[PDB]
Design a protein around this ligand. Sequence first.
Ligand SMILES: COc1ccc(Cn2ccc3ccc(C(=O)NO)cc32)cc1
Ligand SMILES: [K+]
Ligand SMILES: [K+]
Ligand SMILES: [Zn+2]
Length: 397
Amino acid sequence: SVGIVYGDQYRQLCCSSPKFGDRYALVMDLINAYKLIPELSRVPPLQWDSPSRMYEAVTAFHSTEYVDALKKLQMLHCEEKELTADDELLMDSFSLNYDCPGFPSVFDYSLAAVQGSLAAASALICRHCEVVINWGGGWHHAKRSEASGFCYLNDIVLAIHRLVSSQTRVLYVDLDLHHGDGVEEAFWYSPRVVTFSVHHASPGFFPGTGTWNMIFLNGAGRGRFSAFNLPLEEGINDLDWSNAIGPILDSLNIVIQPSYVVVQCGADCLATDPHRIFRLTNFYPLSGYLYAIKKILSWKVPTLILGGGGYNFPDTARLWTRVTALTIEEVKGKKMTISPEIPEHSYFSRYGPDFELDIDYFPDSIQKHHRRILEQLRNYADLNKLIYDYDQVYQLY
Ligand SMILES: COc1ccc(Cn2ccc3ccc(C(=O)NO)cc32)cc1
Ligand SMILES: [K+]
Ligand SMILES: [K+]
Ligand SMILES: [Zn+2]
């Protein structure tokens, strides 16, 4: 079956942040306006027996003094008085500032995504679901002791740690506009979790990693060759993108033969995202996102689908709805008919002025990247004594 994470307390908490506003509500309601929920299995957010239990789960990756800091920051914003100079210092050393500011529910908000992506992992492991979806999750920039890119808690890292600890190999696929640095960094020294991010990279653009470095870093220790990256120039469209990641996705599958696939499905590659970097759409005659998702799903490997970036909320909703519906069809087999027009629901007016499901947009370096990545794959396989037909993989290009 196919699972979605949601719940009343959960929705309220994914909607209390100053930067993502009510995106989670727009998304889950568009999913629900399209009569998609009955076809889906509700996966509830995980809860803990006690504070100590919550704490041990989060510090499987995040440092204790960082969890302390984030929780002190929520308390401080639930008070009216401002932060002491000493408290400012504490928060800065955890980068709890700038694009990672505090707000009254910041710890509860960060914890929720962890709660959802942990329940999603658990529903895959006990084989209740073949695929689970969590649009509240996907915060791939959070580091052990540092907030970054409005990510305070790395739900992905933790959902992944739970999968490998259930030989178990996980493929992480990161379709966001930004390089999934945190997730990549977390499994830098591990071969059982292969990471692969495709993204924009250019000077001064966040975060800075996922590209040629002062050549190409790709993992250390036994983790060597296990972190993959494809940085693209700006302006790329659906088909060029599709052709850029397609062979890489197929080859990672054949070579690695993953026990689980975790997909950060960040929506900021859309043409209508305020970033205006990539020209990806949500069209389904073809959307680069849909191509990739449907490819990943044809593999029949249990799969986690996560959110991430996306700062045009109605258009992120337009994509993630299509992804949801696609997943339902490629897993259960039954056809999903989606009206081209946005159905009436409480957020309908946000989708104006034309109320269409399609977003409103009109549509060499890569081969030197394909060749470099094929070599890296071969080195990965050789290091990890994996059997595979070199030619069969080579043909995919
Ligand atoms: C162009 O419009 C924008 C809207 C929101 C933001 C927010 N923002 C600032 C720094 C930063 C880093 C990473 C991400 C992200 O989506 N990671 O997945 C978002 C970020 C910037 C521009
Ligand atoms: K990415
Ligand atoms: K790795
Ligand atoms: Zn992003």
